[PDB]
Design a protein around this nucleic acid. Structure first.
Ligand SMILES: Nc1nc2c(ncn2[C@@H]2O[C@H](COP(=O)(O)OP(=O)(O)CP(=O)(O)O)[C@@H](O)[C@H]2O)c(=O)[nH]1
Lengths: 117, 122, 206, 117, 57
RNA sequence: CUCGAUGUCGGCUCGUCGCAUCCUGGGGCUGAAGAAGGUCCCAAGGGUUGGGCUGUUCGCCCAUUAAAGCGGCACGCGAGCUGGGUUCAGAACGUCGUGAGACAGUUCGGUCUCUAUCCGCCACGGGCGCAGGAGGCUUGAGGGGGGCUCUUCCUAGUACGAGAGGACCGGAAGGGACGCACCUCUGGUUUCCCAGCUGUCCCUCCAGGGGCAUAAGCUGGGUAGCCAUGUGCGGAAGGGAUAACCGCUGAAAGCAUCUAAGCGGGAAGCCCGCCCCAAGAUGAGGCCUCCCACGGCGUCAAGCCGGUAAGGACCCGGGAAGACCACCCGGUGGAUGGGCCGGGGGUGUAAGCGCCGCGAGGCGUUGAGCCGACCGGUCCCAAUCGUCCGAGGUCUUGACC
């Protein structure tokens, strides 16, 4: 049965996509954001592909990721605001990085991850 | 593909192109009225007249639906389940019957008659 | 009669007048990395390696163990007895002739930890007239004053994947002397794109 | 390298093109002759017509059950390269949507419906 | 339902609590300032390797 | 022993030993021609089917089968199920009772709990050690796994044979059951891969989308991984001791006898050969390479500190390996992940504008569009910086320098 496994995640696909997005969005907002270990890791993979279309740069692409984040402010905000800033590298526009501590009650190890300038 | 208890189809001198087999005639440990095999059964379905009756013969395996995988990587499946009824020796039951060609059968061989007999479309 | 290999992947092919399926064996060519002379290891034999994973990475020891009769710059190595080295370097570019029968083995893909369910046969218990365990669960384990307790060696739940093993006879099918590869129609014993070996024994009188 | 590589290779070796015949088309009932034979090497250019159903794709591939109303429903599935083949000529139309395994056919077909497509 | 029988002494209790045991926390010095830094991390001072982007306010 | 407590049936699931062995073979015997039976001694090796009805195991019956054994273990199994059962009250009658009530007559229902401590089994690790300190390859004493068998065909109807009837030698061929791996192929899955759809509140009306319509609303298909019903393979040879049973040479029984003497024949069984563990077999470690005999301390320095990156651990990052853990490859003098990209294989021609129809939508640019684990490119991003522990490697004897 289980072992050889790809795209590894938690909670529930709907919950997840939910987050991936919400977050992708908030980061887009702040360039850099704070959450937990893989929150970042995978969020990287994702907000990741998004910036990918951000770059894509075109009526269509736009149409798509918008499909996913829903809201102009950012829509354009990214697509033109920074999408250029990046359009030229080889992806990996994500910088996921391990902070100094762990949230309370538990010691959940966290970090900041952002668009890698 | 197979079955023990079975509502199978035929089309020889059938009472009805249908009988229920108990099991496989092979190596004492049935579990598969399989393609091109020979097994046991009684009638399930009716029979206008016909010397057939509501008895039980044994016979040979036609069609199946769940992989007719051949030696030459010849491949097929008919959305049909049926074989031909036998009289002792194997020697088939009826004068004719409604169905046709394809390796597996003849290949099992012992039944050439079935062989030339069910040829054309259907 | 032995080949050392990096097991590739399984795939289908054709032979005579019919298709059938094979597997991809690949082996650069191990070499006399170490010899047990008999007076050396009266369990006389040949140990070899067959590739090379980065040099900047390599313990001194390795470096000189090699030094020995000196050969190359790899890490894949192991041994087998009663097998002369009518060479001091081997490939299979002939080493292993096709239309021959072989025996072979390899690492065994790593399962999981499933009980009466996995591990052993018979899929668990039953399901319906009873569901305070729905479908399957652990068989029985001994008894009152028979041995007066719990048994000692019947199959058991869990870890049953991280191991190794082999397959008896199989066919040598075909030899590709260039890209040191061979198609053999095999039980892909253990993964693929990983490690395996072949040996040939069978005074089998049909 | 690896898999992709080497293997790609061996197969290319044996199958070569399955005999350049690249006429797939979704629909199209069509007809061919496989060597399929036995009894005194009666390898017969046997031709079956069949309404195109599905397929496997990579080295080993197969022009799937194309169902054929013989007088009962018989569906024919056949490996692609499979040297087994000689003639393979289309007749029917490569039409209809939803893609293959559209057994809709073999199943509730009904000649009429059939044509309905 | 299955409440043991007694307690093989503190003895046992230990046997266990014991193999248990509490190890210590990994650390070297700030690639930047000083103090303890666990492998990949920054902190309320140095906070970097290429852009503190952190500490002081 | 047990009434401060031992759950009784039937069945289930996992079974374990046993031989008066059922099928297996080895056999002497026949009223044994052949074939086939039947008559005992040897030998448990594997094997020792489905249903029917019956709460019944037994049983009788259907169909096969090589065959479809008897039984040991509280008639194994409730800390592992099941609970028709017989055995708490009901109510039923049939039956006794003057009736209260009753019948091991019966029939309808009838609240089976379980967070493992111990020794025990299944796994996986942390020690500390098999008197240098080390990286890696082995050999196994000894232990574990599997050893079946059909039917046909081969020599088959020359053995026997008046005739009716049937081959040891032996040789095939496939199959069933079953065990071990494994996806190419075959088919099964695929909670997001793609595609179609109603209802609905949202975006901004229009399309173009968006959450809810159960942890994916519906539907139709769908890799890769894992997985049968798909694929390879296996149960051998063959070597040596023998069971019953067959013989050689030979007396004591100055003729004879396999029989203490000495020799041979012989079983699918016993040791090996077959794979899988394995010196924590303190009775190994055997071999390879390599740092130095490491450096300071009260001689007995078998303690300290650096010693060696000799090496490895730590943290990081990756893994069909994986509960943790240990195993495994890697850390930028890299490709390790994710990213990106080329490509496979998926979906089934997008979004828009364009062309025919009042319209519904139809056709074009479109087999486009969009994509997760599959081959592999390229430091785009993140594997920075560091830290610590780790010889001067048991006792003993003999030998050389
Ligand atoms: N190899 C071989 N087999 C033979 C020969 N003649 C006969 N046979 C075999 O022996 C069997 C007897 O021969 P057949 O001639 O048939 O018997 P028949 O003589 O006709 C009958 P009956 O013996 O009663 O007179 C046959 O089945 C045949 O297969 C021969 O010359 N060579």
């Amino acid at each position: 049965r289980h072992l050889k496994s790809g795209r590894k995640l938690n909670r529930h696909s709907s919950h997840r996509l939910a987050l991936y997005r919400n977050q992708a969005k908030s980061l887009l907002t702040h360039g850099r954001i704070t959450t937990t270990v893989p929150k970042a890791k995978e969020l990287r993979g994702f907000v990741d592909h998004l910036i990918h279309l951000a770059k894509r740069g075109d009526l269509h692409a736009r149409r798509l990721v918008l499909r996913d984040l829903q809201d102009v402010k950012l829509v354009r905000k990214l697509f033109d605001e920074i999408a250029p800033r990046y359009r030229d590298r080889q992806g990996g526009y994500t910088r996921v990085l391990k902070l100094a501590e762990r949230r309370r009650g538990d010691g959940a190890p966290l970090a900041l991850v952002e668009l890698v300038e | 593909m197979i079955q023990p208890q079975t509502y199978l189809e035929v089309a020889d001198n059938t009472g009805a192109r249908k009988i229920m087999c108990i099991r496989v005639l092979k190596g004492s440990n049935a579990k598969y009225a399989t393609v091109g095999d020979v097994i046991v059964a009684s009638v399930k379905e009716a029979i206008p007249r016909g010397a057939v009756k509501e008895g039980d013969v044994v016979k040979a395996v036609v069609v199946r639906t769940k992989k007719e995988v051949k030696r030459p990587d010849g491949s097929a499946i008919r959305f049909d389940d049926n074989a031909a009824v036998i009289i002792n020796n194997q020697l088939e039951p009826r004068g004719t019957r409604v169905f046709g060609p394809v390796a597996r059968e003849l290949r099992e061989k012992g039944f050439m008659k079935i062989v030339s007999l069910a040829p054309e479309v259907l | 009669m032995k080949g050392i290999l990096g097991v590739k992947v399984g795939m289908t092919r054709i032979f005579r007048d019919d298709r059938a399926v094979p597997v991809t064996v690949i082996l650069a060519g191990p070499c006399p990395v170490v010899q047990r002379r008999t007076p050396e290891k009266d369990g006389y034999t040949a140990v070899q390696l067959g590739f090379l994973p980065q040099n900047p990475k390599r313990v001194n020891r390795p470096l000189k163990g090699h030094f020995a009769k000196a050969g190359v710059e790899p890490v894949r190595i192991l041994r087998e007895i009663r097998d002369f080295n009518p060479e001091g370097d081997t490939v299979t570019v002939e080493i292993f002739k096709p239309g021959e029968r072989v025996d072979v083995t390899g690492t065994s893909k790593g399962r999981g930890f499933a009980g009466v369910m996995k591990r052993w046969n018979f899929a668990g218990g039953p399901d319906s007239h009873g569901a305070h365990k729905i479908h399957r669960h652990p068989g029985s384990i001994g008894n009152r004053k028979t041995p007066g307790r719990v048994y000692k060696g019947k199959k058991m739940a869990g870890h049953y994947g991280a191991e190794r093993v082999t397959v008896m006879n199989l066919e040598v099918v075909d030899v590709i002397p260039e890209e040191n590869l061979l198609l053999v129609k095999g039980a892909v014993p253990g993964p693929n794109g990983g490690l395996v070996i072949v040996r040939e024994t069978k005074k089998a009188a049909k | 390298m690896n898999r992709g590589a080497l293997i790609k290779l061996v197969e290319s070796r044996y199958v070569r093109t399955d005999l350049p015949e690249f006429r797939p088309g979704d629909t199209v009932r069509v007809s061919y002759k496989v060597k399929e034979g036995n009894r005194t090497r009666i390898q017969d250019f046997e031709g079956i017509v069949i309404r195109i159903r599905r397929n496997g794709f990579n080295t080993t591939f197969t022009v799937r059950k194309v169902s054929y109303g013989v007088g009962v429903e018989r569906i024919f599935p056949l490996h692609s390269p499979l040297i087994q083949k000689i003639d393979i000529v289309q007749r029917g139309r490569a039409r209809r949507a939803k893609l293959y395994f559209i057994r809709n056919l073999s199943d509730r077909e009904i000649r009429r419906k059939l044509r309905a497509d | 339902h299955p409440v043991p029988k007694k307690k093989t002494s503190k003895a046992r209790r230990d046997a266990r609590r014991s193999h248990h045991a509490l190890t210590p926390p990994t650390l070297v010095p700030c690639p930047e300032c000083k103090a303890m830094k666990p492998p990949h991390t920054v902190c309320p001072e140095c906070g970097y390797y290429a852009g503190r982007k952190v500490l002081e306010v």
